Amino acid sequence: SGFRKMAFPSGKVEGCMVQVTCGTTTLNGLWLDDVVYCPRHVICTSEDMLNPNYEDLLIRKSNHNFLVQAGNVQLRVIGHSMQNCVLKLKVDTANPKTPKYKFVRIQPGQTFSVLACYNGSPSGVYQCAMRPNFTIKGSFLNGSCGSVGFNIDYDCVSFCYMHHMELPTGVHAGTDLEGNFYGPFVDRQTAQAAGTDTTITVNVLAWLYAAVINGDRWFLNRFTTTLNDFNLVAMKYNYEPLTQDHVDILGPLSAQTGIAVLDMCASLKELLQNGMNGRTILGSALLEDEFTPFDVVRQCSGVT
Amino acid sequence: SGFRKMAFPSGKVEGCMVQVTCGTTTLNGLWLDDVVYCPRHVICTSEDMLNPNYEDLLIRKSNHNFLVQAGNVQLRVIGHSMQNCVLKLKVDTANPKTPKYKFVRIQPGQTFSVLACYNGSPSGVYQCAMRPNFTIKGSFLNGSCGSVGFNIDYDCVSFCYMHHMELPTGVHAGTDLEGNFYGPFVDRQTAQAAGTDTTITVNVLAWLYAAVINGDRWFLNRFTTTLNDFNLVAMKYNYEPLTQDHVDILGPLSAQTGIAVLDMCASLKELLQNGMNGRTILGSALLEDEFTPFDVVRQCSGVT
Numbered sequence: 001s002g003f004r005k006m007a008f009p010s011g012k013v014e015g016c017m018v019q020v021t022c023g024t025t026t027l028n029g030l031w032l033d034d035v036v037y038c039p040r041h042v043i044c045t046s047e048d049m050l051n052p053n054y055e056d057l058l059i060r061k062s063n064h065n066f067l068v069q070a071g072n073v074q075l076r077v078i079g080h081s082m083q084n085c086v087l088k089l090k091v092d093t094a095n096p097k098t099p100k101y102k103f104v105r106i107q108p109g110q111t112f113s114v115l116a117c118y119n120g121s122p123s124g125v126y127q128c129a130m131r132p133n134f135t136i137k138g139s140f141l142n143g144s145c146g147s148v149g150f151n152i153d154y155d156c157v158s159f160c161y162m163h164h165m166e167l168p169t170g171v172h173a174g175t176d177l178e179g180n181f182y183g184p185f186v187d188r189q190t191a192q193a194a195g196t197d198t199t200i201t202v203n204v205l206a207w208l209y210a211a212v213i214n215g216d217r218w219f220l221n222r223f224t225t226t227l228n229d230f231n232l233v234a235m236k237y238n239y240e241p242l243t244q245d246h247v248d249i250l251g252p253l254s255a256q257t258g259i260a261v262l263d264m265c266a267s268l269k270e271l272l273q274n275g276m277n278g279r280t281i282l283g284s285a286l287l288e289d290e291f292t293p294f295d296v297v298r299q300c301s302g303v304t
Numbered sequence: 305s306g307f308r309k310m311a312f313p314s315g316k317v318e319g320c321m322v323q324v325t326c327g328t329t330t331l332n333g334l335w336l337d338d339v340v341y342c343p344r345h346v347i348c349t350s351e352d353m354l355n356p357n358y359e360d361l362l363i364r365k366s367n368h369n370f371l372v373q374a375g376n377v378q379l380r381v382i383g384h385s386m387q388n389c390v391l392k393l394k395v396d397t398a399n400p401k402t403p404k405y406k407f408v409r410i411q412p413g414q415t416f417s418v419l420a421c422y423n424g425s426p427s428g429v430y431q432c433a434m435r436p437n438f439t440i441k442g443s444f445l446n447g448s449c450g451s452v453g454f455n456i457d458y459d460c461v462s463f464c465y466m467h468h469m470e471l472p473t474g475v476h477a478g479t480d481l482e483g484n485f486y487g488p489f490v491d492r493q494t495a496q497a498a499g500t501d502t503t504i505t506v507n508v509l510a511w512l513y514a515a516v517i518n519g520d521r522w523f524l525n526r527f528t529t530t531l532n533d534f535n536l537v538a539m540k541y542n543y544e545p546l547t548q549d550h551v552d553i554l555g556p557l558s559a560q561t562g563i564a565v566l567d568m569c570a571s572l573k574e575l576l577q578n579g580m581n582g583r584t585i586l587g588s589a590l591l592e593d594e595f596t597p598f599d600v601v602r603q604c605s606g607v608t
């Protein structure tokens with residue numbers, strides 16, 4: 001009965017990772033059915049990444065310029081189209097390991113597992129959150145583009161993220177599986193100012209609930225607050241304003257711990273204004289905000 | 305170019321997870337070749353866990369009392385033997401998804417990925433470290449026993465851990481894949497005092513090196529120390545004594561950052577004696593010690 005940052009089992013996703021090569025650039029691709037999805041800047045020369053006119057680059061590209069490798073057995077491309085910042089390649093073979101899958105655009109605050117890939121082979125898996133400024137604080141090196149972010153519900157994989165770029169502040173930006181960027185970002189080597197990153201307030205509260213479940217409960221005080229007053233101090237500390245919707249999501253958690261949601265906001269209020277005083281909650285000296293209420297429940301329920 | 309707690313891709317391991325049921329108790333099993341490994345306390349009734357005489361329990365067990373399920377297709381047991389705290393069942397079918405595998409006993413401080421399973425289906429994956437007192441601080445609920453810990457080197461899976469038990473301090477204990485417990489623990493519902501948990505000193509230094517690689521470098525001071533003097537303050541702070549062996553492991557990291565290992569020990573010395581002063585390193589306000597020098601390199605190298 002512990003609590004750690006968990007990631008979805010990656011097996012169902014590794015069976016879709018291929019290596020896509022165009023010219024000299026090589027990256028990762030997602031092979032579902034007879035289609036392979038990859039970032040469109042695979043057609044970019046290392047000097048064209050400064051200001052690329054992607055439309056006048058794809059016209060000079062034919063099918064045979066794309067070398068799709070799934071393991072040491074390569075795939076023949078038959079058709080290729082572009083959708084926003086994603087490239088779609090039609091291959092003469094449907095991936096026999098294709099799972100039940102879905103393309104969903106997630107919302108700021110939601111979490112997902114990331115399968116970091118290099119040259120089409122998986123290197124590792126870790127859990128990420130979509131920050132309110134639509135960036136993510138992942139770990140990515142050269143060739144990691146095309147690695148995807150995903151959730152798993154029983155047997156169906158929800159593909160929500162594909163890696164594209166690293167921002168000047170060290171964080172990361174990418175697109176949904178339809179090629180549409182999360183946030184006001186474009187595939188272009190230029191300084192792109194990410195917005196101010198607020199803290200996902202509803203996630204911090206769910207994390208504090210997972211602590212009470214896990215014996216760590218020194219932070220519960222004898223105070224209380226209202227949703228309006230708690231919100232007022234939350235904006236001074238760059239926290240997301242808590243809505244009645246958020247309160248209702250935490251409700252299941254509130255029911256299992258017997259601590260009203262508004263009373264937990266009170267303990268978080270005094271925690272924000274007075275600090276942890278060198279103490280730690282669930283082995284961290286910071287307030288963690290990359291655990292959605294859903295994540296806490298499924299971890300304390302053994303959801304498979 | 306970020307740094308997060310990564311876990312090995314789990315795909316090669318999920319293909320070995322089965323459900324093992326004996327009487328009413330049901331847990332997870334590791335199906336490699338024509339053998340299935342599982343914790344021996346599957347033969348334990350919920351009242352016999354207080355003081356179980358495992359030898360006089362296995363004799364009253366035959367082959368047909370063990371229901372091995374791999375998915376919704378069940379396996380017939382033909383032979384069963386006991387090895388320390390592990391149970392081995394001979395099945396009439398070799399697992400066609402068996403990988404290149406190995407059974408290795410790891411050492412305190414080493415890290416491995418954990419595939420948390422329930423009813424034979426995987427629920428998630430996270431990274432763990434073998435604490436110097438031979439416990440681990442994982443996340444485990446009822447039915448998680450038989451979940452394994454593993455490392456992956458190219459194509460070969462190194463099975464090092466199998467979950468057995470939770471200790472009173474909230475941490476976890478288990479065996480190697482030969483049934484031999486890590487530490488002075490036994491499979492028995494009784495208060496088992498874990499030893500004092502020291503901090504894996506060599507791991508903290510490697511983590512500080514990953515920070516310098518990642519731009520976070522406010523902690524490097526203009527001081528220096530010797531291995532002997534640094535060790536003296538390390539024992540007052542319950543840190544593992546640093547050996548010349550540890551220094552040589554960090555060497556590759558020392559070479560990439562240009563910071564002598566002994567100078568990094570100096571920065572860690574003053575960090576231990578003066579605190580972070582509310583600052584954070586790599587997004588944590590604590591000194592992290594679950595990153596081996598190997599883990600840092602492979603993450604900054606894209607090892608697949």
Ligand SMILES: *C(=N)[C@H](C[C@@H]1CCNC1=O)NC(=O)[C@H](CC(C)C)NC(=O)c1ccc(-c2ccc(OC)c(OC)c2)cc1
Pocket residue numbers: 027041044049140141142143144145146164165166167168169172186187188189190191192305
């Ligand atoms: C995909 N394979 C990579 C993955 C990146 C590179 C290494 N780590 C990653 O996460 N994608 C890219 O390299 C894209 C190429 C585009 C899509 C054509 N570009 C970038 O990731 C990138 C990095 C850095 C800057 C940058 C410019 C100017 C700065 O000064 C203010 C600055 O400050 C640090 C950064 C731009 C684009």
Ligand SMILES: *C(=N)[C@H](C[C@@H]1CCNC1=O)NC(=O)[C@H](CC(C)C)NC(=O)c1ccc(-c2ccc(OC)c(OC)c2)cc1
Pocket residue numbers: 001331345348353444445446447448449450468469470471472473476490491492493494495496
């Ligand atoms: C396997 N399926 C489980 C997994 C455990 C239970 C829930 N979380 C886990 O990690 N294994 C067990 O339940 C084993 C059974 C043995 C091997 C026959 N036992 C325990 O995990 C266990 C838990 C707690 C105690 C305990 C006793 C006395 C205390 O008071 C001082 C105390 O303090 C908290 C704890 C013993 C054994």
